[model samples]
Target chain A: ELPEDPRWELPRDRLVLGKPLGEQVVLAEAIGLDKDKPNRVTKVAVKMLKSDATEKDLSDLISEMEMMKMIGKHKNIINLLGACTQDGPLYVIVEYASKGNLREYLQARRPPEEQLSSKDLVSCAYQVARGMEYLASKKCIHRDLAARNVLVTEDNVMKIADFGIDYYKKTTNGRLPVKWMAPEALFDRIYTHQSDVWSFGVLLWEIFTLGGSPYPGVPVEELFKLLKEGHRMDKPSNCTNELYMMMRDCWHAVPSQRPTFKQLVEDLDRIVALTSNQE
Target chain B: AGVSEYELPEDPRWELPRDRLVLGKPLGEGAFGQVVLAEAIGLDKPNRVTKVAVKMLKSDATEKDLSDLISEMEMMKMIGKHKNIINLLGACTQDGPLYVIVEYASKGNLREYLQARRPPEQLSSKDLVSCAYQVARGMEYLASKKCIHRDLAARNVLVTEDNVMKIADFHHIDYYKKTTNGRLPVKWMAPEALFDRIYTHQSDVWSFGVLLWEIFTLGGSPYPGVPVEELFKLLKEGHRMDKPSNCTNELYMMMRDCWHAVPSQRPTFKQLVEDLDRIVALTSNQE
Candidate 1:
């Protein structure tokens, strides 16, 4: 018999919404009902495991959620509200970001729109760094860090979402964010916190260029060949030399040379302060 | 080396080496050139790197522009340092583009800071009054030194990481400088200043009132919805800006006192400081 953890379990009667957020996740309103009365309802994003999911996959999902719980509450990281583990299908419920993911948000609110200014874009980068700093402090690595995984709030605050479910899916070889993967992670099947740092560099490039595709003209097949040849993306038209240098610092061939999340937070904080007066 | 007739002061302490300063991205720009964030190598110690704002002139800057930059530096050096005022760190007037280095404010200027925290949850009423009090104290120091800040608005003030407000962006205005057809902050200008082209410490007090309006409203523009030309006519007819929605009767009345038709009747920066301090005290007690 397994021990029942009430805090981590959601109401059995809670219904999932029809809208699917991604491959296995769906938008939902987790409901808490007491006898005949309704206790509460929350807008949430629920990640569901496949019906034929292996034992390892199920364990990984639970462990990742546990890791999030251990990481605790952070303004920048999306909160994991609860889980529906005691039921038929395992469901991990997290907070829903109304403004959608950052990649789409940046694309929709490009320059001269007044919605996204230069300083605002830099602020987004700073917020991400702060969140990553918190994650690193808790000794967690977001192996799949990218702009697509960062969600924006209505207040324009950035919240880092999605932890390491894809990393554990090595048993099932599938599509990955190859452009954002660190060189070592891409080739050697190695993922570390420093690899996440490399991904953050690509994400920064995505943000500064207003959702520009990384390594613009290069095809996925030729990306490794080019990177091996020391071919890096040129400074984006919207990016400053200082910002470009910071991004480049994260792309060091040696993982040890890449800046830690703490350093990144401090650097981005300085950039945010200097650019505050700009519209 | 040949130098212009108007040369920098011979003080070695204020003269920084052009070679040691590494310029970075532009923070802002104006008619002169650009203000950039720079790394001051070994500024205080052998290997210590200090971040500073370097205000520099363009290559195409005329002889008058160079003299103006020098004059700006001299004025800052004269005013010296105050807790609520931006201090002149150092300068590079030896060879290259003249650099006027100043202490960097990590929180940027007051207007943007206020605007960023417009939400009630972010900024309290006490914080707003605190900002006003700090600015008044800065103005009082300037007044004591007989230095009139021609432009005294929220945008000209800076906020530090600890939320300490510092008055910055000083434009050296010759006393009673004549101007019949040039750009002017008509909205913030006192009646006498707009009409007679006269500027006094009282005119700054008037602008301070507009800045107060800006604070209470959370970085709102002065004279809301009123055009510049129309503002001139309205002020001439003894009309003043309406109270901001968030402004209290006490604060609103204080601003009204600053808009006294006669410059002599307006409150001094010293008086404004004392009054604001009292308001801050009362608000804290209530809280």
Candidate 2:
């Protein structure tokens, strides 16, 4: 067998973003992977090792690395290209999304007249649902599902990111994007494919509103109370009624009552098809 | 209103979804048209809006401009989704005026990127080599796609915050303009390209060599002392560009490899990428 390529190892020298053809001339970035070689760019953006790591943390991380290798390649999921565990800073590098997170991508500038069409919004939501469905088939629970977690490629293809790693960061003091979490996920720490459905609904809200902070006017602390009282977010103004119906269905109070990702994908296709044909 | 006069492509995909696009500030102005910074909302994904550079034909452009825009679309549509090449995001010619949108590169062009920096801030030799490799890699991808970049130059290559370098909207110019339009900068052209109008990836390899001279000298234009009109006559007399001031013998030799008299003698972009990778890798660890 041929010897393993050392290219997979940390680009120990490449960090610090200056393109040495000149420094300060190009991007001298803050805290990230040094430089990237050809093929599969695994960036260092907030790459982590649990500061409050325990024995279980180690097991969970190791297990995740194994599973990442098993899942291998998914066009809809962010490629977990490389990871380093032994004798150094524990970091798993993935491809850098140039456009930024979906929330940031959504919030960036807008045209003078008219918002994004309902078809475009539904199309994005549908892409996310497709990603979630892929994770479900892999038997992986993407505990966190939010616009903030879905990253985009330069061409604007959406893929699920921040998967599996959250399980290992249990004690890492990272605050949730509280509005994005499903009720059961926040209350009981119970995350499954169905709970991912609940968060996907709120993700839809963020999308249709062009990145509006969810649960407007309501305090984060009072969310569970409001949710328990059977109040779901109201429909975003510009979204199609068909899309709003699917969002409400995803908010079913009973845990088992939520629709599967497959249902969401099908509903979105029909919903977007209606508005897409509008123009 | 003029839909009757203008003919749209049979496939509606070519028209580009118009409403999702929102135009921003102007990027630049040239003879054929103007480019502006634009924002496109999530057409494919949820909550996805991105800064884009929009190249548009002026509203008053003639029929020739509209047809050139369509021809450019044929190339842009294939390469816009490409990873290495300066990609075509989307194009619209059926509407009021022709508009082609591309992902925004905040750093501007490569020439300006280097000219703005000086000694203390000059890129390290290793990083310079890596940048060359990236350029070659993009060119290699273009070659693999059977696309030839007729106007490759430092002013065309764009840098990203992630240290990614791309050659976007490379062939946006009307190729038919080769006769009347002297807009093609003479300094970056190959001998075959200038004299015979032989535009090929191999000819593009020649331009890549001049780009290397720009990289090493921190964006120094090739034939800096020679006038634009004199470039063709001087090149025919065998006056190729010398090695940039600080370049190494090995690196200079690689640059010279791209300037071979015959296009066939010039190394392929794939070959250049491999050679440059070795040059960069050798010194990267020393840093």
Candidate 3:
């Protein structure tokens, strides 16, 4: 039987306006009414099952939502608003990010509109590292970690999303974002907190490059061969050698040898201060 | 002429039932109307739902607005079917909200797709050339149909889930000139089209050259830093945009020829396809 938490069940009538965002997600605005007087209007992103979605899909979405709920709220983690599993389509509602995903946020603010400084970039990295540190403390593995998965708020704050969704491999139909996946996860289907650290490294590279593709010009088919040859992405033009070294430490072939999220938080904190002083 | 005086193409198959349609996100809007993503119930066969894009008229649309959308539908039907063209599925002209349904391209416009993947070395040159090659093939078919796609740019092309490029969002130059308040695509327009207001398939060729510049630059705007007002004078003085940093000499040479002062001297879509095919060959052979 599926896990059911009645507290999280949202009423169908609460949906004011909802539209399918992707295959299973619906970006919606819901209303909270108090006896015909509206108490509030909330913007939420709901993940639901598609018409032809399998049982595994439902289980994966529910399990991820359940894990997120257990993880609770953090300043840098997407807040789970509620869930609706009682009726029509199962829904996992979470807080909406008005500024879209971080990758696009970075891309849209590139040179000619250089809204982000080196300190700002480091601050974003620091926030993400802090989020991961929290996840790590809970013994949770964020199997997929990339700039595209991180949402940016209206105030430019970063929030991590889609935790543990990649763990359910059987339900995933499309191609995985192999560019951000670690070697062990790619080769042996092994995922660990350490693997998340590897992906965090790629995400940091994405930030420094203002959302540049992970392996620029390299075909997806050839990525495995290149990685196996000990070829990692070169330091981005804007990244400092000190910061680039941290990225390299995360990409260490041995998972255990890779620095933990706790260490990332401390290192990024120092770099943030260093860049701020330089500015 | 007024919208009531206009005549739409009489095809019963083009009219779809409004009840079967479910509207989704708003794709875009213009002076004429707006476009939204929608799902058509049983569009394919019995019990089958197909995703589509619905171009609809606004509630407070004027006679001119109605006429503009009607002309677009007529032109769409006349342009007809091609694998690389945005195929007309049906319409709901008789319904509450006027709707023109077309096949949905999941990957959105070519411009956004390239921009999202933009990086000096990230997007593959093969993939970049392939998108242009497909657009060339689509434009070639349009040329053979005697259709002048006055608007041909990266933003006007749609990419499918399978990474195929389809030419879409066409405009007819004969119907409306510079009388309207709408902004013209000065940067992409040829000098012939800009100076003489002469539009032909060759004029579209000039825009295609700008589109290639956009594709190679991973969706950079053409004539960057050059004001739209200044472009006409500069273009008349035999000036063209310089080669994009990432663009190759062979491709940039092709782009330069498209800017010939004489419209007849511009390469045809057929020749453009052949040239792009050779470029594709060169990129593949390097591997």
Candidate 4:
């Protein structure tokens, strides 16, 4: 039996005012999760496991749905408004980010009228850093932190979503997003704040590159091998040397050598400020 | 740093002990105020005279000027005695000039220590980090209480006989003088402050960043050879001073952070204390 999850009420018709949002969750069969009130047309993107799913699939779906509910509200975090536990193959709702996932959003970034400056890029990093800061303060480890996991509002406010593989059900078989996963976590599954910092470094790299994948074209196995070989990713073409150094600092081999999230926020704060002053 | 017009709260606690204060020789004199090397007796302990620096406004100064000196005394009193803070022993009011007595720093301002080295080798990288660590820790306490140190600089920092750095003249300032083109010490002032006249704790952080450069260069001026009028243009065009020769990349990076153009982008003193604490620790480890 599911323990009494005393957060947001389950199965609320969470609405998504969908627009030109970038990459989004593929809602293949958008079913009615049922609103508390039928009158309200809550345009929420609802996802349910297919009928072909087995018992193990249902368990994975439920486990992830539970993790989704655990993510509460913050300005930079995608709020879990509602969830459905019983009589279902995992149904959940999250805040509708105006520009879907950060990767596609960065790829198809900025209308000519809304183009961002280099300093604005730092602001994007600042928002992501703030999200990580808030999560760390809560002692929450956001297992995956990459551009794809982030969501952008219409006004370009970055909201960190996709707490883990459990929160967002990728249509693919979905083992893990390896590019940004920390070495220690990847090798032995021992997750810590420092491991998260490693992911942040990769996320920061993506932001600087306008959502370029870390270690482009490098396979996941070789990616781990390269990381172990003490080979750090090179700086993005457009990033400042100072910023690239910050990324390198985050990718330190030793967990103790990696910076704290608090330091990361402050470091990003400075970087953002310097970019504004100079660029 | 100084309020042009503020009526200090009238509490008996602020009253100056005239009898316990002894007037002495003038240590330095400027257009705004005169600092005197004096002694205060019986304020902390009976019949014990403590060496102190008494800051008094010029005879030509008016009530407008009195507030600045008075405000500093208020600050010193409020801050009390921390190892890195210059303690206020007493003040001489009710009669002559508004004399605010503070602990005498034998080694004088940080500039003196830097200049005495005649190219600055008295303090190594570790010493520089240690000195900045103390200043940041001290500044953090004051800032937590909502203080904005507008005049933080090497010239404002006082060194002890044992080479410890104590920050002074932080809550006060010199007369607001402007260049022919209307610049007021833009080297230490943040960009917003230079034009907008805005004051924030983050702005103070900008000054501290400059202080870091000055400390690394051993009292060298920032943006060297770029005249004051051209500074706003220089910064606007996205040019920053090169790293000091003796400074580490990490220290220079942290210093650059302090100079972040947006005020909110700058780290708070608490954040700075954390950064400096790490830098100092790393510096010590290397030594």
Q: Whose lDDT is greatest here?
A: 3
Off by over 4 Å in 4: A1-279, B1-19, B118-121, B171-184, B285-287
Models sorted by lDDT, best on top? 3, 1, 4, 2
Among all windows of 10 consecutive residues in model 2 chain B, the one with the lowest summed lDDT is: B175-184
Tens-place lDDT per residue, model 1, A84-108, is 7774667788878888889888988
lDDT of 2 by residue, B71-126 (tens): 77677766646555556666655555667767778877787788777554457778
Per-residue lDDT for A106-177 in model 4, tens only? Answer: 777633324567898888888988988888877788887878778887778899876643312232423237
Candidate 4 docking class? incorrect
lDDT of 4 by residue, B3-25 (tens): 33343344466455777777788
**How does the DockQ of candidate 2 come out?**
0.00
State each model's C-alpha RMSD to the native: 19.9, 27.7, 24.0, 21.5
**For model 4, which pairs clash?**
A11-A83, A16-A43, A22-A100, A64-A166
lDDT of 2 at B264: 98
Error of 4 at B251 (Å): 0.8
Question: In model 2, what is the error at residue B39, expressed in angstroms?
Answer: 1.2
Give the per-residue Cα lDDT of candidate 1 at A175. Answer: 28
List pairs with backbone clashes in candidate 3. A216-B122, A217-B121, A217-B122
DockQ of 3: 0.01
The CAPRI category of model 3 is: incorrect
